């Protein structure tokens, strides 16, 4: 149940349109255009490294130290050997060490069963819930994520986003060819964010 749903639709029309066709989509063109693959997955190598301690922290917080100690190794091997996180040495090493989606403090809240309260949808941010977006901000209370300055964090948010936007530049049809484009967006946020807390 979505209590603030009327606001979220007005801002989704803002995000899906006016701000997507006139700004985002041109930038996502020049990204896949002028940026080479070594740069992109090397940048995704380097941005994922910085969540590893927060993933390690929260896997311990959830109670599977095996998962957490794998991500300590990810960070360990990548930052030391693989060029400050740029090269994924903890991945070429063992099959069991491959990169996965982040489990941050939002998942730890959910693994202990916390309602999201309301779902909301903010201009320029997109999908947001009190529990996850925000509960995710809790990992800036301890190393790596606490080391980032306000200029640093907004760049990480922007470059990771451009990459996700450029990879999906052509699956647009699954959303253009659905009777209901918004509600699969709202439910695809709850698709991803509910498996992560399991």
């Amino acid at each position: 149940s979505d209590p603030l749903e009327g606001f979220n639709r007005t801002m989704f029309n803002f995000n899906f349109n006016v701000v997507d066709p006139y700004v985002l989509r041109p930038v996502a063109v020049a990204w896949r255009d002028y940026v080479p693959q070594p740069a992109r997955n090397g940048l995704s190598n380097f941005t994922s490294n910085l969540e590893e301690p927060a993933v390690m922290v929260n896997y311990f917080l959830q109670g599977d130290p095996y998962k957490g100690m794998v991500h300590f190794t990810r960070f360990f091997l990548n930052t030391i050997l693989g060029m400050g996180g740029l090269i994924d040495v903890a991945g070429m090493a063992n099959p069991q060490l491959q990169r996965v989606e982040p489990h941050r403090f939002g998942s730890t809240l959910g693994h202990y069963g916390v309602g999201y309260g309301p779902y909301v949808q903010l201009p320029f941010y997109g999908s947001f819930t009190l529990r996850d977006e925000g509960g995710d901000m809790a990992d800036g209370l301890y190393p790596v994520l606490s080391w980032l300055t306000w200029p640093m964090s907004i760049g990480k948010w922007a470059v990771e986003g451009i990459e996700t936007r450029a990879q999906l530049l052509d699956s647009d049809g699954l959303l253009r060819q659905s009777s209901d484009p918004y509600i699969l967006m709202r439910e695809a946020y709850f698709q991803r964010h509910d498996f992560i807390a399991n």
Partner: protein, 340 residues
């Protein structure tokens, strides 16, 4: 690496190239382990000749080349020979080897000497019975003449090395050790005592005719787990140094604890945590005083039997005003290790 095996003589030639680097606050003068590049390399041979049905002959030589030096005036800093001995193994009635070899009390301290870069703080080299040492005849006998499986004993004579520094000297001494290992658990106990040389007597710190050190250990090595404890006492043997008066010598008594816990994951990472506290007693002009005190959290990652990479983080507990001047800061190390 076994590089020779013909006519009942095998020659193992081994080595490693360890890229080491320490990180300590400032220039690391007041730190646990120092600051900067600590890269080194080792090279040795293990020899083994089957004389006949009973007799096997062995010989070992192992050396330490440093790689943190320049090629200039200091080129040999810290380059040293760690081991060089030869010996004979008799069928069942044990084994006898004379040379530069490990002291008998290392049989106990090895339990707690498993850390990626640090630890093993009480096994001082050239310090009687606890670390490597010259002119040692070692008789060891495993499984008690074939009678008691799991039970090994060792007994060793230490001939006097009257060197130039009291740090590196000893009179004549004797010592032994015993261990029983039964299904993954391990008990061990060792004791040595040795005359002190005239020059060790004339040191500002430490006073007494005989040095003695003993240590004991519990361990549990099984199912990817390692637990290990050591306790030990020394009289007039642990070398110490007063950084304030610039005197040195030996602590007149020490009481030492070491704990290790490490777990080996199937994907390659072997984290470890340890505790070490060497307390000195009855130091001239000081009294009780801490020589060692830390928690370590660390990890070795194993790529395979030839390559590894580790981080060893020391949380130092020695105080800012240690009256002996022991350094008080933290040290963290990162190593990459090729070995063959």
């Amino acid at each position: 690496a076994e590089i020779y095996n013909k006519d009942g003589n095998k020659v193992d030639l081994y080595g490693k190239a360890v890229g080491l680097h320490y990180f300590s606050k400032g220039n690391g003068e007041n730190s646990y382990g120092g600051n900067g590049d600590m890269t080194y390399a080792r090279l040795g041979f293990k020899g083994e000749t089957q004389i006949n049905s009973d007799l096997t002959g062995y010989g070992q030589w192992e050396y330490n080349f440093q790689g943190n030096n320049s090629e200039g005036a200091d080129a040999q800093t810290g380059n040293k020979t760690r081991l060089a001995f030869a010996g004979l193994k008799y069928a069942d009635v044990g084994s006898f080897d004379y040379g530069r070899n490990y002291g008998v009390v290392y049989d106990a301290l090895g339990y707690t000497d498993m850390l990626p870069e640090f630890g093993g703080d009480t096994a001082y080299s050239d310090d009687f019975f606890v670390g490597r040492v010259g002119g040692v005849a070692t008789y060891r006998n495993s499984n008690f003449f074939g009678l008691v499986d799991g039970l090994n004993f060792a007994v060793q004579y230490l001939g006097k090395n009257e060197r130039d520094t009291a740090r590196r000297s000893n009179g004549d001494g004797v010592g032994g050790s015993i261990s029983y290992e039964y299904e993954g658990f391990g008990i061990v106990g060792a004791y040595g005592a040795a005359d002190r040389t005239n020059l060790q007597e004339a040191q500002p710190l430490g006073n007494g005719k005989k040095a003695e050190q003993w240590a004991t250990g519990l361990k549990y090595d099984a199912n990817n787990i390692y637990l290990a404890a050591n306790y030990g006492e020394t009289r007039n043997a642990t070398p110490i140094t007063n950084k304030f008066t610039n005197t040195s010598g030996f602590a007149n008594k020490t009481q030492d604890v070491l704990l290790v816990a490490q777990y080996q994951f199937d994907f390659g990472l072997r984290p470890s945590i340890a505790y070490t506290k060497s307390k000195a007693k009855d130091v001239e002009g000081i009294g009780d005083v801490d020589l060692v005190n830390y928690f370590e959290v660390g990890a070795t990652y194993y790529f395979n039997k030839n390559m590894s990479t580790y981080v060893d983080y020391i949380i130092n507990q020695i105080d800012s005003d240690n009256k002996l001047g022991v350094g008080s800061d933290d040290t963290v190390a990162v190593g990459i290790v090729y070995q063959f």
